[PDB]
């Protein structure tokens, strides 16, 4: 169906320990496909998914230079933010950027992104119109004035509508075997007595792709959002994801509980119960 491409940049200062490290990682949906690390012995844009390996030498050489120049821009930006926030040169600080585009099943642009954070807090973000900015504070307003004067949004828009959509379309085709395959969750319900009058019912979902999933418990067909322990979806390391949802139930009331599973890979949502 719908797809996304994202690049995640992280630059971290380390006063007294050399220059800030730059990392850029690229994803199509929940699949990482490229990495660059300025701390690597010989920094280079490297493949991280089999379907990107076919890209020619011009791809790797161009991306490596872009990431090497970007490494320097983020070092300049960390210096700039020490001035805008009246901070000392003693502490470690972080700049992060998320950029990318989403497309629909036809490959048409749904929306683009270009947003940044400083110390894990929003800094400046390109609005959905790809023409205006949202600055989080008076320091980000200085960057906003600088970016309005230099018509930066126009340049970001051009990448997001063109290059970003075009390459996502190419990657989806080259990786169609995996990027365009949904693996449904493999599900089961476990039961563990906690004491003589309470037991835990845990609903499992394993081996699914993409990561997006809904796992819920119902008691007498009513959602138990407040009484459910829901772990964050976690990677298995083989491309797939895992998740579980648990409820503490009164002994003898297990059959009043149902686990409901929604996933792209499922033609219809599943209903599970504890099967003694």
């Amino acid at each position: 169906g719908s797809h996304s491409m994202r690049y995640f940049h992280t630059s971290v200062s380390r006063p007294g320990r050399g220059e800030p490290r730059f990392i850029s990682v690229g994803y199509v949906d929940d699949t990482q496909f490229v990495r660059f690390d300025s701390d690597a012995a010989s920094p280079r844009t490297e493949p991280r998914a089999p379907w990107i390996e076919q890209e020619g030498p011009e791809y790797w050489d161009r991306e490596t230079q872009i990431s090497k120049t970007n490494t320097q821009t983020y070092r300049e930006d960390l210096r700039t933010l020490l001035r805008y926030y009246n901070q000392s040169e003693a502490g470690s600080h972080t700049i992060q950027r998320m950029s990318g585009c989403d497309v629909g099943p036809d490959g048409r642009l749904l929306r683009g992104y270009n947003q940044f954070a400083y110390d894990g807090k929003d800094y400046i973000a390109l609005n959905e119109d790809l023409s205006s900015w949202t600055a989080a504070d008076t320091a980000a307003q200085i960057t906003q004035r600088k970016w309005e004067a230099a018509r930066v949004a126009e340049q970001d828009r051009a990448y997001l509508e063109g290059t970003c959509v075009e390459w996502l379309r190419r990657y989806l085709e080259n990786g169609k075997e995996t990027l365009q395959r949904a693996d449904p969750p493999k599900t089961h319900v476990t039961h563990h007595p906690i004491s003589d009058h309470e037991a835990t019912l845990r609903c499992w979902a394993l081996g699914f792709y993409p990561a997006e999933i809904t796992l819920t418990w119902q008691r007498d067909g009513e959602d138990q959002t407040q009484d459910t322990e829901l772990v964050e979806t976690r990677p298995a390391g083989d491309r797939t994801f895992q998740k579980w949802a648990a409820v503490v139930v009164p002994s003898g009331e297990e059959q009043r509980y149902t686990c409901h599973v929604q996933h792209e890979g499922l033609p219809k949502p599943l209903t599970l119960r504890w099967e003694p």
Binding site: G26, S67, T69, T73, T80, S99, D156, T163
Partner: peptide
């Protein structure tokens, strides 16, 4: 494919 940063802060 990612490009150069358009402008610094």
């Amino acid at each position: 494919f990612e490009d150069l940063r358009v402008s610094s802060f």
